[PDB]
Amino acid sequence: GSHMIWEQHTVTLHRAPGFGFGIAISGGRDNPHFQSGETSIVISDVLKGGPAEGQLQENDRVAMVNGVSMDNVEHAFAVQQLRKSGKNAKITIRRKKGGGWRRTTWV
Amino acid sequence: GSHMIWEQHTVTLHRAPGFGFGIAISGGRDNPHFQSGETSIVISDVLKGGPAEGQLQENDRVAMVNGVSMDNVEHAFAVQQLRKSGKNAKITIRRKKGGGWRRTTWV
Lengths: 107, 107
Prior knowledge:
1 helix, 107 residues, 4-stranded antiparallel sheet, mainly beta, cell adhesion, Pdz3 Domain
């Protein structure tokens, strides 16, 4: 295991016909993760071969959309900021790396 | 998503030559999970086609080994309780089900 770090990535997505931006938005201060209590806006899924393929990943935390902070915002507010975008959505995310435990032993 | 539940399972494992019980032990009060801070003893991995196959799963929390509680014990104490077992190890675990979020929206 290793201590957590979060790599920051900024991308610009373009809408595809019938797919939208092709990302699933979860989290929000009024919509915490059931296991952790975490309130961050989160990319919880990514559409296969959609606009976000190879750019965004499951579990990415959304920090900003088109210059608007996602810090401690409600679910609908994040959804509305993305939905109201035109051809492009500029999105900055933090992507977790690391985890596990200091010690693990096979028995 | 759904609220978490943990299904309790008790199994009796028998050692196989060259594999032991075929489980990886992590967690402990002196060995918390790097992301969650969780101190439970945890089955963090299971050997392919070993004694535990189809019986224990990655992320199972260990509650008891051979009548000895694992509640808030140190990593080495859990390891020693398993290691000192003869042919059989009776193990009770709690297995998480559920998670996610109340709301998820595709954009």
